[PDB]
Amino acid sequence: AEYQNIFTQVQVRGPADLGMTEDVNLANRSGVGPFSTLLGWFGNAQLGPIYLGSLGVLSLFSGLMWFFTIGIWFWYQAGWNPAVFLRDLFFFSLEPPAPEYGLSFAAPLKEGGLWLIASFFMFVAVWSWWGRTYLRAQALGMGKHTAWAFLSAIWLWMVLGFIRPILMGSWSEAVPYGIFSHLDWTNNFSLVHGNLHYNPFHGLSIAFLYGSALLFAMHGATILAVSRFGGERELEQIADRGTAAERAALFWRWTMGFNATMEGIHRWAIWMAVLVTLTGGIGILLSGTVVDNWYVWGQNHGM
Amino acid sequence: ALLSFERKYRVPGGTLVGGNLFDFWVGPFYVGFFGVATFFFAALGIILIAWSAVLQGTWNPQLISVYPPALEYGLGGAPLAKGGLWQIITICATGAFVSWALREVEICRKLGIGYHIPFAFAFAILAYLTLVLFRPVMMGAWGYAFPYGIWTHLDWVSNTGYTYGNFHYNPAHMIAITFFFTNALALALHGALVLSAANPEKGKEMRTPDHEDTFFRDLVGYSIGTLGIHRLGLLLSLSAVFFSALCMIITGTIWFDQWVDWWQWWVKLPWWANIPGGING
Amino acid sequence: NFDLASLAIYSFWIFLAGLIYYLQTENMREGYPLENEDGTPAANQGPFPLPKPKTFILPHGRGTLTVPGPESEDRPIALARTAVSEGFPHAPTGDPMKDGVGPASWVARRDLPELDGHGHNKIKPMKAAAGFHVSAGKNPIGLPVRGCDLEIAGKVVDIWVDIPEQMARFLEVELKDGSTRLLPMQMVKVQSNRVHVNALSSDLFAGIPTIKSPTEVTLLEEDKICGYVAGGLMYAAPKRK
Ligand code: BCL
Ligand code: BCL
Ligand code: BCL
Ligand code: BCL
Ligand SMILES: CC[C@H]1c2cc3[nH]c4c(c3C)C(=O)[C@H](C(=O)OC)c4c3nc(cc4[nH]c(cc(n2)[C@@H]1C)c(C(C)=O)c4C)[C@@H](C)[C@@H]3CCC(=O)OC/C=C(\C)CCC[C@H](C)CCC[C@H](C)CCCC(C)C
Ligand SMILES: CC[C@H]1c2cc3[nH]c4c(c3C)C(=O)[C@H](C(=O)OC)c4c3nc(cc4[nH]c(cc(n2)[C@@H]1C)c(C(C)=O)c4C)[C@@H](C)[C@@H]3CCC(=O)OC/C=C(\C)CCC[C@H](C)CCC[C@H](C)CCCC(C)C
Ligand SMILES: COC(C)(C)C(=O)C/C=C(\C)CC/C=C(\C)CC/C=C(\C)CCCC/C(C)=C/CC[C@H](C)CC/C=C(\C)CCC=C(C)C
Ligand SMILES: CCCCCCCC/C=C/CCCCCCCC(=O)OC[C@@H](O)COP(=O)(O)O
Ligand SMILES: CCCCCCCC/C=C/CCCCCCCC(=O)OC[C@@H](O)COP(=O)(O)O
Ligand SMILES: CCCCCCCC/C=C\CCCCCCCC(=O)OC[C@H](O)CO
Ligand SMILES: CCCCCCCCCCCC[N+](C)(C)[O-]
Ligand SMILES: CCCCCCCCCCCC[N+](C)(C)[O-]
Ligand SMILES: CCCCCCCCCCCC[N+](C)(C)[O-]
Ligand SMILES: [Fe+3]
């Protein structure tokens, strides 16, 4: 019956927090939204405000057009039958042009041309969203760590849909837009390149993906374990180390022989996560361009 | 040697067994009864691996592989060279991992902190036991467990997966992957957010947690809050491992076909299975 | 045979070694250099060097933090060695709860309140926080507070709330002499008829360190309160039967 601070016992509510202004153009910031008692059991209850602005509107417009170009194609693959649509929803796929079209933009609409159009909309949606993660931090005087971490994810996505297909010579190498089909694409990619288990950058990517769960479990549990000393107030703990920061460090020093600081655990954290897609993107980029067969390659280089 | 602030925390107490008998440190490491237990289990398990490597004829860590018994041994004991070493090493590993968790418990007690960390570590242990104990017992043979080898246990993953076609279609596996990807996304975002407030633009005072909330509200319309994000990180990572264990404990025990068949239920529902066109009619 | 994939993977592992070296030194900005158990610098500091100083400019005129920098506990530590060799416990010389050692430890933080981004006190009693109220769950105000000796130590008279995070952080508890103490929210179990506090017996509630102002709490005071209460799990434990 010792409380665990996983769910809130007593929720409290006051006036909506409108937020810091700094250099944010308040003209592009929405009103505040309603409060969610449901969310309040686990985190904050307040919804909104949200920032709009040119980049966000462009990203949202472009991202919805991506989504709609795929939807329209699904409706056409379903013969416009709504029940066929719901039935095969996970089986439809907007496929890239066939290999004979190379990198040409002359693939007919129904045979890859719509894939290129959807990809254009997706490309604008992601890069304008990236610009937004940078500008939202700038407007508040904050560091640019979010935009930089986001670039690591974008890197893997750029490699999969754009850079590797270009270096391979055809859009046909790109990932299709479908629930199951992109899973089939992923399995096929490994079989075609001689087992991605033996791509060392893929093994690293796994180490960092497993390590991200290891580390967030460690850190999430650690902070809850010292929440009885205000441990989740990490910025003031960085500015003015408290017994929460000290007990957290000593738990780990006594357990495994070394430890973090309140600030430095977040450098471990950001690097553990971004290295997932950083190494992952490298491993995919080398596949087929440089290495046709990872298992064979590994045997000739010592694996 | 101590951290500059450490001495005031190095008091007697908090042990679960043995009183003050093992209540001391070796350098930075706390010992305790379960530190002794960890050492014994780990040292013996490592000795037995060395024994297995001697029987194998290699000292190469990339080649050493300790295999479980052949399937024909069922759940029986096997001779050392033919699965017994794997069996004893598995007992030692379980012994070392559980002792590690209980040592952490003692550490939590001496420091007066919550028990969230060994509780979270227990999920990893249970996922390990799912693969070497729970699932092999339910299938009837130790030989369904994975071998202890750097590359051979990856081949086991691939052999086990492709037994069921494309393992992607395992639905608990989809949920587990979604928790793993979402966890890494949240870890990147959380690390970036704190660092972006502690290390603001040049020429700026350190930001406050209000700036963190404002940043995420501006960006996506919601901030889970500083307590919420650590709750979330723990939930995502533990849910990933829970659904990992679930996706394997059902595979070969209550599901035997190609996993892609599971969704075929949705496909062949009588009211739309025979409509021409699309994919499934 | 040493192709581009080879060059890339060996390069990444070199990068990774440098990153780990960097990350470890970054995490030595607190608590290092290591000390002997007598407080003097330890001869063996390990293979990683101390990081070069960095500076944080604190908002609200609060000054600047430089880390690493010269460290001191800035408080007396009522503990003595139990051994001449290293690695053994240091035993409390007095009352470890009152002296703030072991799991009752506190850190000499700033004797000022944490402020929000607008420079206002982050934590306020609900009676001073216009519009704040219990919005879900059992409202604990007016309930009796029970210790691990199953006896009643006082009455909940207010909730101290983190305003920016809209979170209950402390229960203000009125004792039989009419004074109050703060009880950390993470150390109470709010029930239908009572608030149960397993960490403290009823007679230890008045030992909770007091706050010097009725409407605010300083970081120093929060550390003394939170340390004292958590210390009860070990030091009030002979009363938990
Ligand atoms: C989890 C689901 C599968 C599985 C699927 C995969 C796949 C797929 C991959 C790995 C990879 C690895 N796995 Mg495996 N792995 C399993 C179970 C295990 C267990 C275990 C006791 O359960 C262990 C110790 C390992 C260990 C390892 C490492 C050799 C490597 C990097 C992991 C990592 O950084 O994780 C996160 C953890 C950390 C960052 C913390 C540090 C962990 C260190 C590196 C562990 C060293 C273990 C040591 C070599 C063996 C025991 C040492 C004893 C002293 C004898 N696996 C099961 C069977 N594993 C990758 C690889 O490169 O393999 C060659 C890879 O591609
Ligand atoms: C049969 C299948 C093959 C195989 C084929 C592949 C292939 C092919 C790939 C991987 C990749 C990965 N694999 Mg593998 N994989 C196998 C076996 C494994 C095993 C295992 C237990 O055996 C494990 C643990 C893994 C694990 C991993 C990950 C470490 C890695 C993906 C990282 C990531 O975050 O991607 C997810 C993150 C992203 C895709 C980035 C996304 C960023 C963009 C910008 C997001 C856009 C959002 C968009 C606009 C939509 C918005 C929606 C609105 C919000 C509503 N694989 C086997 C051998 N694997 C990838 C990799 O890096 O390989 C080196 C990869 O390409
Ligand atoms: C890494 C190697 C492979 C790959 C291998 C796998 C495997 C294997 C699995 C997935 C899984 C998923 N992948 Mg994939 N995946 C790849 C690249 C992508 C890209 C991309 C931009 O490149 C996208 C958008 C997705 C999207 C998705 C989701 C459908 C799902 C959960 C992801 C997740 O946890 O996100 C974390 C992010 C968030 C939680 C934020 C919100 C994200 C939302 C939900 C994304 C919506 C996308 C899409 C528009 C949804 C339409 C739904 C209905 C059809 C209308 N993948 C590459 C090519 N992916 C899992 C799954 O369930 O598959 C069915 C799974 O098992
Ligand atoms: C060809 C292979 C198949 C496939 C077949 C399988 C099989 C088979 C399995 C998985 C499992 C998993 N797969 Mg799959 N998988 C494929 C493709 C993928 C892709 C992808 C992008 O395509 C992804 C992301 C995944 C993802 C995943 C995870 C959901 C899960 C692994 C994590 C886990 O269980 O941790 C759990 C964590 C542990 C087991 C670690 C335990 C650690 C212990 C407690 C402590 C060790 C201490 C150590 C010895 C100390 C050393 C010394 C110190 C370091 C000093 N797979 C393809 C389609 N996958 C596995 C699973 O769910 O397992 C339950 C599994 O068995
Ligand atoms: C290792 C790095 C990890 C990572 C990092 C990362 N991702 C990030 C970031 C970072 C640091 C961001 O800053 C950024 C972000 O903003 O996060 C909150 C992002 C983000 N990562 C995302 C997704 C994502 N990340 C993933 C992975 C990871 N990201 C890695 C694990 C994955 C996968 C496959 O695992 C996914 C799916 C997004 C949540 C976000 C990027 C947002 C973006 O680019 O959006 C562009 C698109 C739109 C604005 C709109 C698209 C339209 C919708 C699909 C509409 C559907 C609903 C409905 C039809 C609406 C109808 C309305 C009608 C009224 C018209
Ligand atoms: C549940 C969420 C995630 C999680 C959580 C987690 N792990 C944890 C903790 C937590 C909260 C700890 O407190 C604990 C720790 O101290 O971390 C620093 C731990 C830890 N997780 C570890 C590893 C680890 N965690 C993993 C995963 C995860 N850990 C999950 C994704 C993985 C993988 C593969 O994904 C690995 C490899 C260790 C760093 C540590 C546990 C240390 C420990 O138990 O030490 C005692 C034992 C020894 C020192 C050695 C024992 C040797 C054996 C007797 C012989 C070898 C047997 C083994 C089966 C051989 C395998 C060979 C491989 C090639 C397959
Ligand atoms: C009710 O129905 C309506 C019609 C209203 C709908 O809207 C329904 C909508 C749906 C059902 C949506 C269905 C959507 C999906 C199934 C999405 C699934 C997507 C994935 C699983 C993601 C797969 C991976 C995608 C990747 C890797 C894309 C890479 C993109 C490239 C990096 C971009 C490259 C750019 C190109 C090729 C164009 C070049 C042009 C330039 C200007 C550079
Ligand atoms: C050829 C293959 C190489 C990879 C190709 C490009 C891939 C793009 C990836 C980008 C790097 C990964 C993210 C960096 C780590 C996370 C951010 C970080 O910790 O550093 C940023 C930090 O200073 C703060 O920024 P400022 O506020 O501007 O100082
Ligand atoms: C064994 C030691 C040497 C290993 C071999 C040589 C290493 C080769 C390459 C390694 C370099 C990896 C460095 C990664 C981290 C880069 C430092 C960094 O991040 O700088 C920016 C930072 O200041 C400001 O960040 P913020 O304060 O967060 O804005
Ligand atoms: C009116 C607008 C409608 C509202 C739409 C709701 C969308 C919610 C989406 C994601 C929340 C999960 C965020 C997970 C990542 C958080 C990173 C972090 O550290 O947050 C800490 C906290 O937010 C500060 O300290
Ligand atoms: C706003 C749309 C963005 C277009 C960029 C991608 C070009 C697609 C070309 C499709 C070709 C169709 N057609 C008939 C010319 O063959
Ligand atoms: C930022 C955290 C650093 C953690 C580094 C983890 C190293 C794991 C080693 C995995 C080995 C992968 N591979 C294929 C190259 O052998
Ligand atoms: C693979 C990720 C683990 C990286 C390990 C970093 C080890 C750092 C050990 C530093 C020793 C600390 N000490 C005891 C000298 O203070
Ligand atoms: Fe944190």
Numbering used by the authors:
A (entry chain M): 1 to 303
B (entry chain L): 1 to 281
C (entry chain H): 9 to 249
Q: What did the study's authors say about this model?
A:
The cofactors are arranged in two membrane-spanning branches, A and B, around an axis of pseudo-twofold symmetry. The RC includes two bacteriochlorophylls (BChls), PA and PB, combined into a special pair P, two monomeric BChls BA and BB, two bacteriopheophytins (BPhe) HA and HB, two quinones and a nonheme Fe atom [Allen et al., 1987; Fig. 1(a)].
The corresponding structures were determined to resolutions of 2.1 and 2.04 Å, respectively. The structures obtained using the different techniques are in good agreement for the positions of the atoms of the main chain. Changes in the structure of the mutant RC were mainly confined to the side chain of the M197 His residue, to the C2-acetyl group of BChl PB, a conserved water molecule and Asp L155. It is important to mention that there is a significant difference between the F(M197)H mutant structures obtained at 100 K and at room temperature. In both of these structures we observed a rotation of the acetyl group of BChl PB relative to the plane of the macrocycle that differs from that seen in the WT structure, but in the case of the room-temperature mutant there was a more pronounced rotation compared with the cooled structure. Since Phe is bulkier than His, the Phe→His substitution created no steric problems, and good structural conservation was observed throughout the bulk of the protein–cofactor system. The electron-density maps are consistent with the donation of a hydrogen bond from the imidazole group of His M197 to the C2-acetyl carbonyl group of BChl PB. The involvement of His M197 in the hydrogen-bonding network also appears to be related to stabilization of the F(M197)H RC structure.
